[PDB]
Amino acid sequence: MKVILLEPLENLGDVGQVVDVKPGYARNYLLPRGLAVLATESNLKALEARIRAQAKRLAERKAEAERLKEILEN
RNA sequence: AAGGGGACCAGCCUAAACCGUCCGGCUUGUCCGGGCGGGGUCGUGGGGCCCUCGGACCGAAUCCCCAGCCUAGCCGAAG
Numbered sequence: 098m099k100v101i102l103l104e105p106l107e108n109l110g111d112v113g114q115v116v117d118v119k120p121g122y123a124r125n126y127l128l129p130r131g132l133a134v135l136a137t138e139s140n141l142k143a144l145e146a147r148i149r150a151q152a153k154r155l156a157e158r159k160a161e162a163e164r165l166k167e168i169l170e171n
Numbered sequence: 172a173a174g175g176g177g178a179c180c181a182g183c184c185u186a187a188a189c190c191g192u193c194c195g196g197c198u199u200g201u202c203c204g205g206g207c208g209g210g211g212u213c214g215u216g217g218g219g220c221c222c223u224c225g226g227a228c229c230g231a232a233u234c235c236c237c238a239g240c241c242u243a244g245c246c247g248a249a250g
């Protein structure tokens with residue numbers, strides 16, 4: 098059963114990452130303890146969109162940073 | 172059972188794409204979701220979206236009116 102992890106998890110996987118595990122573990126451990134959610138399509142969009150936002154504001158930093166580089170140095 | 176002879180006869184509304192708006196969630200938006208509206212309904216495949224061109228006839232199974240009918244009756248030839 099595919100699920101997206103909410104936390105860095107011992108020898109299962111990384112925060113934000115999508116993994117495959119036996120149904121009961123998802124249903125009766127992970128999901129209730131809030132360490133993950135169903136890797137559904139509906140909130141696969143949510144993941145994919147935040148990935149976009151974190152990539153948006155980060156390289157946006159390197160943009161305004163590099164622009165202040167050019168002002169200075171000269 | 173198909174087929175043939177007949178009775179009767181009538182076909183429609185949605186879901187999804189996409190678009191709009193209200194609402195709440197927390198993981199703040201090109202977000203996910205739930206309402207309502209618009210769009211759409213097909214098998215010669217159909218629909219959405221994007222370009223070019225084209226710009227009144229139909230019509231209910233709903234509603235209203237009326238005939239007709241039902242729920243009392245009446246006229247009715249000639250010892």
Ligand SMILES: [Mg+2]
Pocket residue numbers: none
């Ligand atoms: Mg027959």
Ligand SMILES: [Mg+2]
Pocket residue numbers: none
């Ligand atoms: Mg027949």
Ligand SMILES: [Mg+2]
Pocket residue numbers: 178
């Ligand atoms: Mg008959």
Ligand SMILES: [Mg+2]
Pocket residue numbers: 204
């Ligand atoms: Mg929705």
Ligand SMILES: [Mg+2]
Pocket residue numbers: none
């Ligand atoms: Mg919406």
Ligand SMILES: [Mg+2]
Pocket residue numbers: none
């Ligand atoms: Mg909506």
Ligand SMILES: [Mg+2]
Pocket residue numbers: none
């Ligand atoms: Mg087509």
Ligand SMILES: [Mg+2]
Pocket residue numbers: 232
């Ligand atoms: Mg109808």
Ligand SMILES: [Mg+2]
Pocket residue numbers: 247
């Ligand atoms: Mg009499």
Ligand SMILES: [Mg+2]
Pocket residue numbers: none
């Ligand atoms: Mg008499």
